[PDB]
Design a protein around this nucleic acid. Sequence first.
RNA 1: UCAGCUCGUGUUGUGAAAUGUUGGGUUAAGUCCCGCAACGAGCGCAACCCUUAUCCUUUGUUGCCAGCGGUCCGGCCGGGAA
Length: 233
Amino acid sequence: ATVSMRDMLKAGVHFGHQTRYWNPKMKPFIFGARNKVHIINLEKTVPMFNEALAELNKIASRKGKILFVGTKRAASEAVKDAALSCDQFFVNHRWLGGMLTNWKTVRQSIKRLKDLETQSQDGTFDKLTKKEALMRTRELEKLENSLGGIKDMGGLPDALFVIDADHEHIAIKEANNLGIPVFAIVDTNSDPDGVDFVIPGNDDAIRAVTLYLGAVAATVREGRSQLASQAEE
RNA sequence: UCAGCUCGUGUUGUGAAAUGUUGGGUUAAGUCCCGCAACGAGCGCAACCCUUAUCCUUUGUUGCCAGCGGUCCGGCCGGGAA
Ligand SMILES: [K+]
Ligand SMILES: [K+]
Ligand SMILES: [Mg+2]
Ligand SMILES: [Mg+2]
Ligand SMILES: [Mg+2]
Ligand SMILES: [Mg+2]
Ligand SMILES: [Mg+2]
């Protein structure tokens, strides 16, 4: 695709963790070690990323919903920006256990967030007796921080794209439970067993994270434009 | 009158069960915040009730007497609404 080994090398995709923290299941994707730090095999990274991008493009063309999951402090704002410029949904703060498997309950929180936003736009807060308004705006802030990116999702997504599979093991487990395909960036210290589409690469570097997110956003934009509530655009 | 006791859905365990409800703080309080495979909800806590402590408005008799006028010195009388 558009991404090539050279720009991943520039970003730092090939850097992993220290050898003592590795998961032995990452041995096929590990190229070697330098200064007691693993080096991911970009020669394997590139085609796997291309295949994941193609599958994401197909999912977007079929009018599917893409959930971008990443809550690390180095990928939160990047994930939010990618999802916003891609018109898909995101979770960039702490994943609530049961967001997908207990969606019938998380829906009520989504509705409460919508109602609080409507009240804020109305102006019932200054009608309220000050302390109640402060409590309600604090609740609005908390609900926006938690479920801001899935407010308009309206149901289970058709695909998850995850940064730091190990950090988001709960989301990946829920997606495996529900049958939702998982594309994920898997570092050398992570277990790739639950991931349908593994992309070995650095998940701690802001440059690499932005590279992955930009490629995914671009490919899903093309996939969406392929249908766009029409025949072919 | 102790701050406790539970449920739904989700998740863990072959199972009895567990989690939530534990943890760091804080409170009279499972009180509240932060964290967190939990997300929410109910009965309890608190508040809504009565009374007491301050002020304002209205009303002023059988209750009151500051300014007045008398007076048998008793708000006693005419009055006054302070
Ligand atoms: K056991
Ligand atoms: K339960
Ligand atoms: Mg990493
Ligand atoms: Mg208990
Ligand atoms: Mg218990
Ligand atoms: Mg309580
Ligand atoms: Mg808790």
